[PDB]
Paper text:
In this study, we produced and characterized two rabbit monoclonal antibodies that recognize a monophosphorylated Akt peptide. We generated four clones with high selectivity against the phosphorylation on 473-Ser of the Akt peptide (RPHFPQF[pS]YSAS) through rabbit immunization followed by phage display and the subsequent ELISA assays. To better understand the underlying binding mechanisms that confer higher affinity and selectivity, we determined the crystal structures of two scFv (A4 and C7) and a [name] (C7) in complex with the phosphorylated antigen. In summary, the static crystal structures demonstrated that both antibodies, A4 and C7, possess a basic residue (Arg) and a few uncharged polar residues (Ser and Thr) to recognize the phosphate group of the peptide antigens, which is reminiscent of non-antibody proteins that recognize a phosphorylated amino acid.
Specifically, the antibody A4 exhibited the highest binding affinity of 3.34 nM toward the phosphorylated antigen and 1.12 μM affinity toward the non-phosphorylated antigen, which corresponds to a selectivity difference of approximately 300 times between the phosphorylated and non-phosphorylated peptides. Another clone, C7, displayed the highest selectivity toward the phosphorylated antigen with a binding affinity of 26.9 nM, whereas no measurable binding to the non-phosphorylated antigen was observed. To address the lower quality of the C7 scFv crystal structure, we also determined the crystal structure of the [name] format. Although the quality of this structure improved very significantly (1.33 Å resolution), the overall conformations of both the peptide antigen and the C7 antibody, including the orientations of their side chains, were nearly indistinguishable (Cα-RMSD for the aligned residues of the heavy chain, light chain, and peptide were 0.52 Å, 0.54 Å, and 0.62 Å, respectively). Interestingly, some of the N-terminal and C-terminal residues of the peptide antigen could not be modeled in the electron density of the crystal structure of the C7 [name]-phosphorylated peptide complex, confirming the intrinsic flexibility of these regions in the interaction with the C7 antibody. The C7 antibody has a 14-residue CDR-H3, in which six residues are within 4 Å distance from the peptide antigen, and the hydroxy group of a Tyr residue (H-Y97) is within hydrogen bonding distance (2.6 Å) of the phosphate group of the antigen. Additionally, the Arg residue at CDR-H2 (H-R53) interacts with the phosphate group of the antigen. Furthermore, two adjacent Ser residues (H-S52 and H-S54) at CDR-H2 form hydrogen bonds with the phosphate group, with all residues of CDR-H2, except Gly, positioned within a 4 Å distance from the antigen.
Residue numbers in the entry:
A (entry chain H): 1 to 134, 138 to 216
B (entry chain L): 1 to 217
C (entry chain C): 3 to 8, 13 to 14
The structure:
């Protein structure tokens, strides 16, 4: 009943990558699985699938560079040699057929894992407070999260307990190849200081910035 | 080979309108009707809406329907809601012996037009510790608006033509509104050698402006 | 044959 992909990271062009999809609530002995990817800002693209008895099928574009294997609880995707065009979120999904009919669809999906095929090394974000120029009754504060590689970062406020009035904008990749985003929160003049918590798994970093008007 | 040609690539609909999306297969589908439709909210995984051309999946509202057979298929949203702002994809199954077993259409971005709301605007001067890094990044936000806006930056009255990156939140699921961040990046030398920084957000004919002087903040 | 995926 749930799927979780792992293994996404920054990949040097020309090197191999293995992703894993861990399955909870059913056995792959009884369920076919597929991998699908999506480049940033682009469409879904089918890669290949593995049947219950372990027969693999690949898109023609993928044949010979992508390999699927499985256990009863995991399914892997190995990329032989990676290139920039392989930068994508990779999803695993259940393929919906049984011994009586084939419904044709992929009806259970994981959240995806992000693969970044790029030159560069992992780089932790620089975090800067956002506050208005110099009391106002209602004020927006924030954190600018600049210059990181790869995606993702996670931004929370007050350790995830401040929720209402938060807007965390989609990341943008700069021409440098680094990423940036801002997160803002609306508070009022009666509020205590607010703290943005910025995590960057690729560099095992966690940085807090406390902001007040 | 086997492909699905999905049209349109984008469409905008008022709340309560009807949206039909077309998927044309380049060859007949497996079982004649194994065409599925997915919804994808920005940054989220795909969700199955319809399978076998016309069967509504689990957890899908009745305003979604699908039709077709052979090579021509459609998805209809009957009475679009703000929550329906998303990208939709068809997916066809083909005979593995003659083509790729599956393929996706190229997607359709659906924008939902809600009640017009003019933006308010905020500008954020750089934190004190930015300028020592050699680069300064100024942030402007346009709040809670519909329809789309354009953003321009002016530095001592000169409209900027580089250094600007914009990012828009997904449409709000209740009221269809957007939020926008616009960031201007300059060198520290450029920043320190200019005074007035203005973010101008224009919706139709109507501009809203926020400014600061480097000297003041 | 069927399921189609369960044949090379």
């Amino acid at each position: 009943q749930s799927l979780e992909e792992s293994g996404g990271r920054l990949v040097t062009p020309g090197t191999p990558l293995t992703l894993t999809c861990t399955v909870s609530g059913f056995s792959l002995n009884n369920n076919a699985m597929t991998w699908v990817r999506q480049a940033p800002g682009k469409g879904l693209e089918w890669i290949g699938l593995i049947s219950r008895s372990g027969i693999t099928h690949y898109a023609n574009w993928a044949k010979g560079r992508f390999t699927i294997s499985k256990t009863s609880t995991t399914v892997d995707l190995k990329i032989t040699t990676s290139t920039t065009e392989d930068t994508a979120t990779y999803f695993c999904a259940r393929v919906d057929y049984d011994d009586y009919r084939d419904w044709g669809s992929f009806n259970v999906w994981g959240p995806g894992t992000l693969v970044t095929v790029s030159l560069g090394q992992p780089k932790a974000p620089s975090v800067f407070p956002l506050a208005p120029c110099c009391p106002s009754s209602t004020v927006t504060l924030g954190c600018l999260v600049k210059g990181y590689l790869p995606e993702p970062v996670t931004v929370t406020w007050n350790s995830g307990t401040l929720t209402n009035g938060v807007r965390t904008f989609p990341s943008v990749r700069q021409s440098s190849g680094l990423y940036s985003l801002s997160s803002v929160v609306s508070v009022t003049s009666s509020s205590q200081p607010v703290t943005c918590n910025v995590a960057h798994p690729a560099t095992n970093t966690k940085v807090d910035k406390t902001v007040a008007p | 080979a086997a492909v699905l040609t999905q049209t349109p690539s984008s469409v905008s609909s008022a709340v309560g309108g009807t949206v039909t999306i077309n998927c044309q297969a380049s060859q007949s589908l497996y079982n004649n009707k194994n065409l599925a439709w997915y919804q994808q909210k920005p940054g989220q995984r795909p969700k199955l809406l319809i399978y076998s051309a016309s069967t509504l999946a689990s957890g899908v509202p009745s305003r979604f329907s699908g039709s077709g057979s052979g090579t021509q298929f459609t998805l209809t949203i009957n009475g679009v809601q703000c929550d329906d702002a998303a990208t939709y994809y068809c997916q066809g199954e083909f005979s593995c012996s003659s083509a790729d077993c599956n393929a996706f259409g190229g997607g359709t971005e659906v924008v939902v037009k809600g009640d017009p709301v003019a933006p308010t605007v905020l500008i954020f001067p750089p934190a004190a510790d930015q300028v020592a890094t050699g680069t300064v990044t100024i942030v402007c936000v346009a709040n809670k608006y519909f329809p789309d806006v354009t953003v321009t930056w002016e530095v001592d009255g000169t409209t900027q033509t580089t250094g600007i990156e914009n990012s828009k939140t997904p449409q709000n699921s209740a009221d269809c509104t957007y939020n926008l961040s616009s960031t201007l990046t300059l060198t520290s030398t450029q920043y320190n050698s200019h005074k007035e920084y203005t973010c101008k957000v224009t919706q139709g004919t109507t501009s809203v402006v926020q400014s600061f002087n480097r000297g003041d903040c | 044959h069927f399921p189609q995926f369960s044949y090379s």
